[PDB]
């Protein structure tokens, strides 16, 4: 009756053993094959080829860079610090196969063997270019949707015709796939003298209109139809290959994964979280690996996973997030502390390590202030179960009814005092400071409501002090002087 999915997953990974050393190279073979065969799917295209120099001169004409993108782009594997001269070379030849390919695709049509192999050469000169990051994927999202549009029109007309007709489908497909341009099938369907087809014949003007927007997308997209209809499936298959083949490798080295994981299963976080992040670091080691380097695969992901773990625990694993830099320097600290202990035989001081760590006591004492964790309200610091620590804290925000009485008696005396003032000025003194309002009026607006004069108001401040301060009403203020 085991409740622990630790057992579940160690058992079910127990299904799969380790497969190595040609499966390493044979998943690789199937996948590089799928890659080069999606690129053969790219070797085929029609006018759809109006693609490469377009979105490539998109990046050339505006001073193509050598920052992140070309660290993504071609960078061929040698079975570099990119030259700005070889780039300028590479921005001239590709324009030629394109243009010599256009009219030769317009020469008699598309079925032409020499032209076909010149387009295979166009691929070949494309096929020196690796299958490289996002703008490619975006250029492929293009196709991912254009296919779906093609199938959208299919779905639309399959609905409209096949769901309605519902007996007559055979002859429809026959004469339609036959003719496909003119309305020579309709009367060919109707030579059998069908009165309900006579009833429909009033709408034929709109039926071939419903075929008009069918055929409109043909211009709006520009397909060689069979050609694209092959290219789509070919690349679909070059995808499916790897999508299958890698899962083998993934299931293989699960035991390396779990093994390395269970070093840093000191009581830092938890089993399966380390395990999950190890799967992550793996799968990213999988996306990239070369057999060609001729090394054991283990080393590779042993780097990758290690990274993933090493900073995932640092990201997570605390109620306090600490950015990595502190984490690193804490590692410096903790390691060097111990060397200095051996050297010393005792605990080294903040200054001694301010010297040796190479940074000043500021940052020492600083970090020393920082590195501790929260201690969980529900602890019974009452040794007997009488007091969990949550009780003894204070609520230091809210309110004092005593001070409420204080301020209320104050404001009462305030307005009681303001009652004994000049009426010309009473108004002013109200609005000048925002008494009895949500407002803050101090200046020119007052100048227009009452009188543009502004600094005789100041003289009247002096007045009011004299009217009030000289012991007339001071005594009731002075009880609030202690406030």
């Amino acid at each position: 009756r085991t409740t622990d999915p630790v057992r579940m997953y160690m058992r079910e990974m127990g299904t799969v053993e380790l497969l190595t050393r040609e499966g390493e190279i044979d998943i690789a073979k199937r996948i590089e094959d799928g890659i080069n065969q999606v690129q053969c799917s790219v070797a085929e295209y029609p006018e759809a080829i109006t693609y490469l120099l377009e979105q490539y001169d998109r990046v050339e004409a505006e001073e193509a860079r050598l920052s992140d993108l070309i660290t993504g782009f071609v960078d061929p594997n040698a079975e570099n610090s990119i030259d700005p001269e070889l780039a300028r070379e590479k921005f001239a030849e590709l324009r030629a196969q394109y243009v010599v390919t256009r009219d030769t695709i317009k020469a008699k049509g598309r079925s032409h063997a020499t032209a076909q192999e010149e387009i295979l050469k166009l691929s070949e000169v494309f096929k020196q270019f690796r299958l490289v990051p996002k703008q490619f994927d975006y250029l492929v999202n293009s196709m991912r949707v254009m296919m779906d549009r093609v199938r959208t029109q299919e779905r639309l007309i399959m609905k409209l015709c096949v769901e309605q007709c519902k007996m007559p489908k055979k002859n429809f497909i026959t004469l339609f796939t036959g003719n496909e341009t003119s309305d020579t099938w309709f009367n060919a369907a109707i030579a059998m003298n069908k009165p309900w087809s006579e009833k429909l014949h009033d709408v034929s003007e709109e039926v071939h209109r419903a075929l008009q927007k069918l055929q409109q997308i043909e211009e709006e997209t520009g397909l060689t139809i069979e050609q694209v209809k092959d290219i789509n499936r070919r690349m679909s298959i070059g995808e499916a290959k790897a999508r299958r083949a890698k899962k083998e490798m993934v299931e293989a080295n699960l035991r390396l994964v779990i093994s390395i994981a269970k070093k840093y299963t000191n009581r830092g976080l938890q089993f399966l979280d380390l395990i999950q992040e190890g799967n992550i670091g793996l799968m990213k080691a999988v996306d990239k690996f070369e057999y060609r380097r001729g090394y054991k695969f283990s080393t590779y992901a042993t780097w990758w996973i290690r990274q993933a773990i090493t900073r995932s625990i640092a990201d997570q694993a605390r109620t306090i997030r600490i950015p990595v830099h502190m984490i690193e320097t804490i590692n410096k600290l903790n390691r060097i502390s111990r060397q200095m202990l051996q050297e010393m035989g005792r605990e080294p001081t903040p200054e001694e390590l301010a010297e040796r760590m190479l940074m000043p006591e500021d940052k020492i004492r600083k970090v020393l202030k920082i590195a501790k964790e929260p201690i969980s309200m529900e602890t019974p610091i009452g040794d007997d179960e009488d007091s969990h620590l949550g009780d003894f804290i204070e609520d230091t925000t809210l309110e004092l009814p005593l001070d409420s009485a204080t301020t209320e008696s104050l404001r009462a005396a305030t307005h009681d005092v303001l009652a004994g003032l000049t009426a010309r000025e009473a108004k002013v003194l109200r609005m000048r400071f925002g008494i009895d309002m949500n407002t803050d009026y101090t200046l020119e607006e007052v100048g227009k409501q009452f009188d543009v004069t502004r600094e005789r108001i100041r003289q009247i401040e002096a007045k009011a002090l004299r009217k009030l301060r000289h012991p007339s009403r001071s005594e009731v203020l002075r009880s609030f002087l202690d406030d």
Partner: protein
């Protein structure tokens, strides 16, 4: 704020849509420097609310220039900061999951519904196997599991035509599929087909589930969840300390792990992995979820670095540190304080010492208002520093205020109501509260380190409540029983006993006075003895006229003390009352009768003065204990020498080997006990009257003047066994084993123990001490259970117009009266008109109060049975009348309606128990004799002998009221008959206590028929005598050839015809089980009354009693009248062929005939006649009998239990909790509602009071009444909130939630927890205002 009622419900998803402000994002909190919240995480101000005044996180938008602006840098908003606590965010879910309470608890609620078991569903939802959503091809089935591999077989077989899946989604789909209607009608139908018991039960269960979901409208698909709420921070805070070092909840990591695992999940769903890891992640997900809901339920519990498990949500609601018991019912409070406590001897009843600074602190705003009123402290800060000056006016004012401002008084344990009181203040120059001493009683308190605490009657309502209710004048009799609780304790009673006393010795004997005043002149001039009988006049009074005093004077030869002590008498009373040395019981009856006769205050004032004079004279009386008071008698040594010689003789015998060891044990232990008794006689006769003092005569002695003895005789302290402890040998000692030791103690405390003797004392000492520590939890546990049942009840009504209840008769049996039927009636109200043995003299018109005029008026009469409008026979919907209860004790009058009856019942009942865990028959005296429901026979000796076991003999007095009642065996041998007159001291009855006789009331020849040697029997022929019979073996030992043949020696006439049971046609021969061995031979005669055969051979108890615990060994009863025979022959147990007179025979049940039988295979009983032996089941009694039988049974039982410890409580306390154990009756027929189900006997009595009424003659349904164990009865209740508060809350939550429950706030618990007033007593009036307001709309 105000609201009527509450309503549970499921949280719909659209309800969280309806509650929500924002879905949440990354979980971080702050900048390690800028200790300020981050966003869309945990402490995000933006959605719960703002922290400071009108500021975004960066500070772009402020000042109300940017009034409504949300800050486009940080998306942070502008508002006040209170809504944090009323809002709740939410979180959308990437998947669906199900809620656990609808799964894991008993009946599942979900697979329960579905008729799919649980582990099936587990195995689906641990994601290890698929299962048919829908048998597309019905080839396969909905609710059909398909393994990961068998699934494949079906899969490549068919493909399209099934839905068979795994995970919450599939379950959504299915529950979303299933209809309620058709299942429901079809269940109701095919119940009719075979409503077999378990089957029908299950049918009902699912039917209810169906129609519940129908009518509540709650949905099953909402069982599954895809959005989850979120809690605001300050219930889960994160707060600092001096070191910049913080503190956090147990919870925040739960959300942290949950959100992070969601992040991982969605992250990996972007990426199209194998579903293996998808499974692993989501199992971690559900793990985190249901561990949040309950950490330590399902898997190995979850801890932090603590290694303590992490507190669930559920835990916070739960246990004692749950909300209910921790901070909602018991609570810290402002305006209170506490103190060490000392006496105030000189005080008066109303007074309490009060360290003034306590009140000073407590009465602050009073005097501040008073100084703004005077204006010396015009402002308040001035008030503070003036307070701080200590102005005398401070104190003048404080005395001014404290006048008439009453106060509360608290010791713990406040076990019963009187463990707190309310007195008037009086101030003192010290940090030591004084009090009136006598009320240590109610507190059980003592001046040894005890403590007390105080609370304040701020509101005038509380002020007046206090002064009218908990003013000590109010409450001086217990409400449980009618005694004063202000008994003068130890010293006062003793000085009293000293004064009111009659030496012969001292002086001043045989003179005359006019009155006690000149005796005071003497005694205070110091001239006369005070405990000295001397002639003098008095002038007493009496209200013999219609409450009008009757004056007259005359003489008495009385002690001087008693004469003086008259002086305090308040003018109603005889001098005969004051004519003795006044035992502590005497003082009790003094104060009793004063209050009984006059009213309160004379008795009050009397009492105070008595305490005062006790102080005076016992300070005068002279008192010390010492070493020469301690005297051992002389004739003790040689008794021990006799014991030594005798045990040496018994030693020589055991050495010789004749006598055994356990025999010897009983011998030795009994003779040592006799030695202790002899020593007791010695010391008591050598101490109590050791004093010889001569007055005008040679020699004479009287009561001793030794300190120790008078301490014993006053009842102040001491006891004869205790004096034996100091002086004599004290008995013997039980070791912790429970054995009892063979060598008791020799010396005493006066001489000095032995090493071993004290080492031996240790055992039982520590035993009793651990018991002292560890019997109390039982009491408190018990107590809160009891009250948990019974709060709901309060008096509804004045007269319920109801009809008779139970009969009242005394409990005198075994010895003399043990409750006078007088005392039983006291304050009760009749069931009916009631007359006198002088017949047809009615005094109640079906109901009156029965006060001591009536009680004694009818104690004259020899009536000995009355009925009463019972506690339970009352019939008010939702409570009772007042009549059916009768009289308030502690008041001493009929209650006016509106007060809690349960609470005082339990305080009456459980309060005391804390201390309280720690042959022949012979007439004594002459009188009439009554034996009824009797069939017997004049035996061959000429006397009566029983044939009806029901009979028991009585000693009836010459009048007719019973003196004694005693059981008598079937066929036991008497020396007397019924309704005769016989001398005291006579052994009428005799029987071998091992025989169970087989008397023959027929007379006739006997022949060895039906029975053959070794076959049904053995033939044992007595080696002793020579005369025997066919000798019947037991169940086992006879050879099985005739163990299927009931052996029967047979009675016949001369002709061989069976002598019929004379007068009836039933033949008369005996089917013999084992041990009924006959002495006569073949052809021999028995006579009427002639044996053919003879057949040879605590507190938690009460916990079982009221819990309705039902024993293991029933002494079972006759289900129905008529003849009976035995059943199938022991496949495990034998059975019982019932045969009614005219009804149906077939009913039989298993019998262990390893436990003796009472009836035999050709013997008749009446229904409700006992058949087996041992204890029995009360459930059967109610099942068979009515109410009064079982009622009477247990009340007698447990009253005898506690009366062992000599503890006196009236019955109604008991009668009332019973009716709360009957809140339900199970239905018989149907047509009103469903067939049987246990439904409110109240609501039952309503619907029959409507439906069987002219609505119909009957559509509805008869019923039977149902018992419930108290702890289950409580739970099995309408209200849930009370039911949520004490036990098993979670399941109660679920069960309410499922159905759309809605409480109505009537109960005490209900209306307290809301902060409303009581619907009773004080707020009775306001609540009934609200009642007829709702009546009035």
């Amino acid at each position: 704020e105000e609201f009527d009622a509450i309503k549970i419900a499921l949280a719909s998803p659209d309800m969280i849509r309806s509650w929500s402000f924002g879905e949440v994002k990354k979980p971080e909190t702050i900048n390690y420097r800028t200790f300020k919240p981050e966003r869309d995480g945990l402490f995000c101000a933006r959605i719960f609310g703002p922290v400071k005044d009108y500021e975004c996180l960066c500070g772009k938008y402020k000042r109300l220039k940017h009034r409504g602006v949300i800050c486009e840098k940080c998306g942070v908003e502008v508002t006040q900061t209170k809504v944090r606590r009323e809002r709740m965010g939410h979180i959308e879910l990437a998947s669906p999951t199900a809620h656990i309470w609808f799964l894991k608890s008993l009946p599942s609620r979900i697979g329960l519904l579905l008729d799919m078991p649980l582990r099936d569903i587990e195995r689906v939802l641990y994601f290890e196997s698929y299962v048919v959503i829908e048998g597309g091809m019905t080839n396969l089935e909905r609710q059909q599991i398909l393994t990961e591999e068998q699934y494949l077989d079906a899969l490549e077989e068919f493909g399209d035509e099934f839905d068979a899946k795994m995970g919450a989604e599939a379950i959504q789909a299915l529950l979303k599929s299933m209809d309620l209607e058709q299942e429901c009608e079809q269940l109701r139908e095919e119940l009719n087909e075979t409503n077999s018991e378990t089957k029908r039960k299950k049918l009902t269960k699912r039917i209810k589930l169906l129609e519940a979901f129908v009518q509540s409208g709650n949905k099953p698909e909402w069982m599954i969840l895809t959005v989850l709420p979120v809690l605001p921070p300050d219930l889960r805070p994160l707060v600092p300390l001096d070191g910049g070092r913080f503190a956090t909840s147990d919870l925040n990591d739960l959300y942290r792990r949950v959100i992070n695992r969601n992040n991982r999940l969605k992250r990996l769903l972007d990426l199209a992995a194998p579903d293996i890891i998808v499974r692993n992640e989501k199992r971690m997900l559900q793990e985190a979820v249901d561990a949040l809901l309950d950490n330590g339920r399902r898997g190995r519990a979850i801890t932090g670095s603590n290694k303590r498990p992490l507190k669930s949500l559920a835990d916070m609601i739960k246990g004692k540190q749950g909300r209910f018991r921790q901070n909602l019912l018991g609570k810290r409070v402002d305006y209170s304080g506490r103190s060490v406590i000392t006496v105030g001897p000189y005080l008066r009843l109303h007074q309490c010492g009060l360290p003034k600074k306590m009140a000073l602190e407590l009465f602050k705003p009073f005097i501040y208002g008073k100084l703004e009123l005077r204006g010396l402290a015009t402002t308040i800060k001035a008030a503070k520093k003036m307070v701080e000056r200590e102005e005398a006016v401070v104190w003048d004012i404080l005395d001014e205020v404290i006048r008439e401002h009453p106060v509360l008084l608290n010791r713990a344990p406040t076990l019963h109501r009187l463990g707190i009181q309310a007195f008037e203040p009086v101030l003192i120059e010290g940090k030591a509260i004084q009090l009136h001493p006598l009320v240590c009683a109610a507190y059980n308190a003592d001046f040894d380190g005890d403590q007390m605490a105080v609370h304040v009657p701020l509101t005038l309502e509380a002020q007046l409540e206090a002064r009218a209710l908990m003013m000590s004048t109010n409450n001086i009799l217990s409400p449980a029983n009618g005694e004063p609780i202000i008994v003068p304790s130890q010293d006062v009673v003793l000085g009293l006993y000293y004064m009111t006393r009659d030496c012969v010795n001292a002086k001043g004997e045989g003179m005359v006075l006019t009155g006690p005043k000149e005796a005071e002149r003497l005694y205070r001039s110091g001239l006369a003895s005070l405990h000295a009988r001397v002639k003098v006049r008095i002038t007493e009074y009496e209200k013999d006229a219609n409450g009008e005093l009757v004056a007259k004077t005359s003489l008495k030869d009385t002690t001087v003390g008693r004469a003086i002590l008259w002086m305090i008498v308040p003018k109603g009373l005889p001098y005969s009352i004051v004519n003795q040395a006044l035992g502590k019981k005497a003082i009790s009856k003094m104060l009793n009768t004063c209050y009984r006769i006059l009213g309160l205050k004379p008795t009050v004032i009397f009492a105070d003065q008595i305490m005062y004079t006790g102080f005076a004279y016992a300070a005068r009386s002279g008192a010390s204990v010492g070493i020469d008071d301690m005297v051992i008698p002389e004739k003790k040594h040689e008794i021990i020498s006799e014991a030594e010689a005798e045990v040496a003789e018994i030693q020589e015998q055991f050495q010789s080997g004749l006598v055994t060891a356990g025999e010897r044990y009983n011998k030795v232990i009994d003779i040592w006990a006799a030695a202790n008794d002899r020593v007791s006689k010695a010391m008591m006769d050598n101490l109590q009257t050791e004093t010889v003092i001569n007055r005008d005569g040679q020699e004479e002695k009287q009561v001793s003047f030794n300190s120790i003895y008078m301490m014993a005789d006053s009842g102040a302290r001491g006891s004869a066994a205790q004096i034996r402890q100091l002086a004599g040998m004290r008995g013997l000692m039980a070791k912790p084993d429970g054995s009892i030791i063979e060598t008791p103690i020799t010396a005493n405390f006066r001489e000095g123990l032995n090493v071993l003797q004290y080492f031996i004392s240790t055992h039982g000492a520590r035993k009793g001490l651990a018991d002292t520590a560890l019997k109390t939890a039982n009491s408190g546990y018990l107590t809160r259970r009891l009250v948990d049942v019974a709060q709901d009840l309060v008096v509804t009504e004045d007269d319920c117009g109801t009809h008779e209840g139970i009969m009242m008769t005394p409990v005198i049996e075994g010895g003399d009266v043990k409750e006078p039927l007088r005392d039983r009636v006291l304050g009760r109200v009749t069931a009916e008109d009631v007359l006198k043995p002088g017949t047809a003299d009615i005094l109640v018109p079906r109901n009156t109060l029965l006060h001591e005029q009536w009680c004694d008026l009818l104690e004259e009469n020899s009536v000995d049975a009355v009925k009463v409008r019972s506690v339970v026979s009352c019939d008010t919907d939702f409570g009772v009348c007042a009549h059916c209860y009768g009289r308030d004790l502690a008041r001493g009058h009929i209650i006016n309606k509106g007060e809690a009856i349960g609470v005082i019942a339990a305080q009456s009942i459980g309060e005391p128990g804390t201390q309280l865990t720690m042959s022949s028959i012979q007439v004594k005296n002459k009188g009439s004799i009554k034996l009824s429901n009797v069939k017997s026979v004049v035996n061959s000796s000429g006397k009566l002998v029983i044939t009806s076991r029901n009979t028991e003999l009585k000693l009836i007095d010459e009048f007719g009221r019973t003196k004694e009642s005693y059981k008598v065996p079937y066929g036991a041998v008497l020396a007397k008959g019924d309704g005769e007159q016989v001398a005291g001291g006579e052994t009428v009855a005799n029987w071998d206590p091992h025989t169970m006789p087989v008397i023959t009331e027929v007379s006739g020849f006997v022949r060895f028929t039906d029975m053959i040697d070794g076959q049904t029997i053995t033939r044992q022929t007595d080696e002793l005598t020579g005369l025997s019979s066919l000798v019947v073996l037991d169940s086992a030992e006879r050879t099985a050839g005739g163990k299927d043949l009931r052996p029967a020696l047979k009675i016949v006439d001369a002709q061989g015809n069976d002598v019929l049971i004379p007068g009836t046609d039933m033949p008369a021969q005996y089917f013999l089980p084992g041990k009924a061995i006959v002495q006569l031979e073949d052809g021999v005669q028995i006579s009427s009354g002639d044996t053919l055969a003879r057949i040879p051979q605590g507190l938690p108890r009460v916990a079982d009693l009221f819990e309705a615990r039902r024993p293991k060994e029933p002494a079972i009863l006759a289900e129905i009248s008529g003849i009976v025979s035995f059943g199938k022959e022991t496949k495990g147990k034998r059975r019982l062929v019932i045969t009614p007179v005219d009804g149906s025979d077939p009913y039989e049940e298993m019998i262990p005939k390893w436990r003796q039988l009472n009836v035999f295979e050709g013997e008749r009983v009446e229904r409700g006649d006992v058949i087996s032996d041992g204890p029995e089941a009360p459930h059967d009694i109610l099942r068979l009998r009515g109410v009064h039988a079982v009622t009477r049974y247990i009340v007698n039982e447990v009253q005898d239990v506690y009366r062992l410890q000599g503890v006196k409580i009236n019955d109604k306390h008991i009668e009332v909790i019973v009716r709360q154990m009957l809140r339900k009756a199970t239905i018989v027929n149907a047509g009103s509602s469903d067939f049987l189900e246990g439904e409110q006997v109240e609501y039952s009595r309503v619907k029959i009071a409507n439906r069987e009424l002219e609505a119909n003659g009957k559509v509805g349904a008869t019923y039977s009444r149902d018992l419930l164990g108290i702890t289950k009865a409580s739970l099995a209740t309408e209200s849930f909130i009370s039911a949520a508060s004490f036990q098993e809350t979670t399941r109660v939550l679920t069960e309410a939630a499922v159905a759309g429950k809605r409480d109505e706030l009537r109960g005490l618990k209900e209306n307290v927890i809301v902060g409303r007033l009581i619907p009773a007593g004080t707020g009775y009036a306001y609540h009934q205002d609200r009642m007829r307001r709702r009546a009035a709309g």
